[model samples]
Target: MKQIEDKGEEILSKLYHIENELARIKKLLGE
Candidate 1:
């Protein structure tokens, strides 16, 4: 579950970027 509170677009964008990078590293290492 997630809250509907506004955290601004920048925060969400940064979070997405970090999640993508983490996924990339996991795939590269076959984790």
Candidate 2:
């Protein structure tokens, strides 16, 4: 159970990073 939870956290972190990258790219496009 603990291992599964850790994996979920890791996946969430990657998603957050990807979202940040997308936001930056959108900002560049807007400019």
Candidate 3:
């Protein structure tokens, strides 16, 4: 119950970080 909810939030945060990293790399490559 509560554990599942917390895990979901953690996964969302990880995804957000991954997106930011990808954007940064793209900018570096001049895309």
Candidate 4:
């Protein structure tokens, strides 16, 4: 259970990073 939770957290962090980067790119394009 502990390992599963850790993996979920790691995936969540990565998803957040991807979303943030996408937002930044959109702003750069003047969106």
Q: Write the per-residue lDDT of candidate 4 for residues 1-31, one digit (tens) a residue.
A: 9999999999999999999999999999999
Off by over 4 Å in 3: none
For model 3, the run of ten residues with the poorest summed lDDT: 1-10
Q: lDDT of candidate 2?
A: 0.97
TM-scores across all candidates? 0.62, 0.90, 0.88, 0.81
By the lDDT metric, which is better: model 2 or model 3?
3
Better of 2 and 4 by lDDT: 4
lDDT of each: 0.84, 0.97, 1.00, 1.00
Q: Distance (Å) between predicted and true CA of 5, model 4?
A: 0.6
Pairs with steric clashes in candidate 1: none
lDDT of 3: 1.00
lDDT score of residue 13 within candidate 3 = 100
lDDT of 2 by residue, 1-31 (tens): 9999999999999999999999999999994
Q: Clashes in model 4: which pairs?
A: none
Candidate 1, 27: how far from true, in Å? 0.6
Each model's backbone clash number: 0, 0, 0, 0
